From Swiss-Prot:
The keyword Cell membrane applies. Changing G12R: In lung cancer and bladder cancer; somatic mutation. Changing P34R: In CFC2; characterized by a defective GTPase-activating protein sensitivity and a strongly reduced interaction with effectors. Glycans are attached at T35. This is GTPase KRas. It comes from Homo sapiens (Human). Changing D38A: Decreased interaction with MAPKAP1/SIN1. Acetylation at Lys-104 prevents interaction with guanine nucleotide exchange factors (GEFs). Keywords: Acetylation, Cardiomyopathy, Cell membrane, Cytoplasm, Deafness, Disease variant, Ectodermal dysplasia, Glycoprotein, GTP-binding, Hydrolase, Intellectual disability, Isopeptide bond, Lipoprotein, Membrane, Methylation, Nucleotide-binding, Palmitate, Prenylation, Proto-oncogene, Ubl conjugation.
Amino acid sequence: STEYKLVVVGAGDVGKSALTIQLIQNHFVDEYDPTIEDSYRKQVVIDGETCLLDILDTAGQEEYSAMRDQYMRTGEGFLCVFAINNTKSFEDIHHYREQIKRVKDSEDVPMVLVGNKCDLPSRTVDTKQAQDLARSYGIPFIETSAKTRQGVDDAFYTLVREIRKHKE
Ligand SMILES: C=CC(=O)N1CCN2c3nc(OC[C@@H]4C[C@@H](F)CN4C)nc4cc(-c5nc(N)cc(C)c5C(F)(F)F)c(Cl)c(c34)OC[C@@H]2C1
Ligand SMILES: Nc1nc2c(ncn2[C@@H]2O[C@H](COP(=O)(O)OP(=O)(O)O)[C@@H](O)[C@H]2O)c(=O)[nH]1
Ligand SMILES: [Cl-]
Ligand SMILES: [Cl-]
Ligand SMILES: [Cl-]
Ligand SMILES: [Mg+2]
């Protein structure tokens, strides 16, 4: 099987830890420690190929030492996560993409835009608004809901396909 190192980036409280557990453990955690950054592993099948994933749930203080960049440079794909009910988290996407392009030293890094918390009624970030931003980036965009499993597995598998295309 092929290994894929994934990194989940995004502002705080957007659902990175909830999305990560919903894919690994297949259940929703409504209150995970926001200061905890850990790595998870699970082997799934993606369009026939068996894929072993190592997903990094990022958290903690924003810091750009050579050790941190080198550790973040090990990620092959990135999930830039925002909340459809938090405008600021959607404006901070340009920050994470810019920092990912810097440490990876490339302008075509495999990544997928994630609009989490789509199960909530009041939405402030429009769907087509985030869709045109991902179209400008040239990256996929998927709306997910860690509570209802909606698109969770879809968002993660789409990122592995972007890595597959970039590799070949
Ligand atoms: C609860 C809190 C929480 O979970 N949080 C909040 C802090 N938060 C991060 N907030 C920021 O800005 C925040 C604001 C917004 C913008 F205005 C600039 N900042 C003032 N920037 C972060 C940057 C990185 C980071 N660092 C590197 N060395 C290299 C790369 C390639 C990255 C990557 F990949 F991420 F880009 C990482 Cl790992 C972060 C960041 O961890 C995630 C945590 C998640
Ligand atoms: N309604 C709803 N709430 C969510 C969802 N995902 C996360 N949350 C809530 O957002 C809060 C923080 O989520 P968290 O997993 O810590 O995201 P993170 O801080 O960015 O890593 C939690 O109290 C969750 O209840 C979702 O899909 N739907
Ligand atoms: Cl499973
Ligand atoms: Cl950091
Ligand atoms: Cl910098
Ligand atoms: Mg978290």
